[PDB]
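Thanks for the sequence, V.! I ran BirA bifunctional protein right away. Repeating your input here for the record:
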Amino acid sequence: DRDRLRPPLDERSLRDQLIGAGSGWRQLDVVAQTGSTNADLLARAASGADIDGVVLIAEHQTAGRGRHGRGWAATARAQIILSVGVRVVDVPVQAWGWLSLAAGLAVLDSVAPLIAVPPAETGLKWPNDVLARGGKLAGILAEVAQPFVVLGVGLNVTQAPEEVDPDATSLLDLGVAAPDRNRIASRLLRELEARIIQWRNANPQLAADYRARSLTIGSRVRVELPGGQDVVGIARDIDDQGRLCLDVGGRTVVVSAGDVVHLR
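Predicted structure:
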């Protein structure tokens, strides 16, 4: 399995092209490597640091995660990995579930313009995954540390397969030949900033847009919740609380968050 090299993210470019003036991005760093962009930001938080609008990107990550929960093994520059701090305390606590939803929407937005022709099943899997042709293209990890939330984005641009990562998919696989990570990071952050603003405003557009690109709605899934608990039903729609309206044989189950696995 040969593989290596790849272009490096230019921090100086992303900085002066994304930080300050009008943008809601206060600060940006690129590191060669870390365990979890989320964990580190979660830590600046706990150290006193205002991480509102602070962006942190890793070239490589041993195990994407943080406060609670481990991770897995990946490969260097095979993907875009970044975290952003978001002040959430001014928004109704019942609405925080939408953040991870917005983030996944923002990723898909950043990427779609790259594909010449829409592939098979490619959209959003409630509540944390961006899929393309039924593979995991991107993962979204939302974590809370009042008055903050950290949004982690792991996006498979190059590849870095295939055990984490057990059925994911990289842009290359969707026929994008020479994806520029910098251009992508820049768009993704622009999409993110926008979606966040919407979320803060309780824009109804945010939910319609989500439902519009939802692969989960209309189909039949298994929702893996904490432990060996699993629910199988048909997703009808989501509520204003970013929760899944799940139709289990005629009876509705409203699961807040958790893993899903499209069956139908």
